[PDB]
């Protein structure tokens, strides 16, 4: 019973670490969107100058 | 030479075009500022939700 308890307690916090990871991954995407939106416009402006 | 006979401000037409160009450059720079300065808001709003 003691060794069941140990692993239950460990797993519960291991469950939170994954949520940390999901949050980090989610935050980076919002940053990358605007980079994409700026490159889209640079290319089109360069089309006008030719 | 036509000015001296009348004494009124030689070469006006080319003198005034530079003024028009000077104001145009300022307007263009201001608009360029506005666009970036708008994109910032869109990025900032998303990061807060995340």
Residues B47 and A30: beta-carbon distance below 8 Å: yes
Question: Could A31 and B47 be called an inter-chain contact, meaning their C-beta atoms sit closer than 8 Å?
Answer: yes
Nearest to B47 among A23, A30, A37 (CB): A30
Q: How far is CA B25 from CA A38, B18, B19, in A?
A: 23, 11, 10
Q: Which of A37, A21, A30 is nearest to B47 (CA)?
A: A30
Burial B3-31 (b: 16+ CB within 10 A, else e): eeeeeeeeeeeeeeeeeeeeeeeeeeeee
Please state at what angle helix A2-48 crosses helix B12-49, rounded to 10 degrees: 170
Question: Could A34 and B43 be called an inter-chain contact, meaning their C-beta atoms sit closer than 8 Å?
Answer: yes
DSSP label of A5 = H
Q: What is the resolution of this structure in A?
A: 3.4
Using the Cβ of A12 and the Cβ atoms of chain B, whether some distance falls under 8 Å is answered with: no
Q: Which residue has the tokens 């239950």?
A: A8
């Amino acid at each position: 019973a003691n060794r069941f308890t140990a692993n239950i307690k460990g797993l519960t916090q291991a469950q939170r670490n994954a949520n940390d990871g999901i949050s980090l991954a989610q935050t980076t995407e919002g940053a990358l969107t605007e980079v994409n939106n700026n490159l889209q416009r640079i290319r089109e402006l360069s089309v006008q100058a030719a | 030479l036509s000015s001296i006979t009348s004494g009124a401000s030689s070469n006006p037409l080319a003198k005034l075009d530079a003024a028009l160009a000077d104001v145009d450059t300022l307007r263009s720079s201001l608009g360029a500022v506005q666009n970036r300065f708008d994109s910032v808001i869109s990025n900032l709003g998303t990061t807060v939700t995340n």
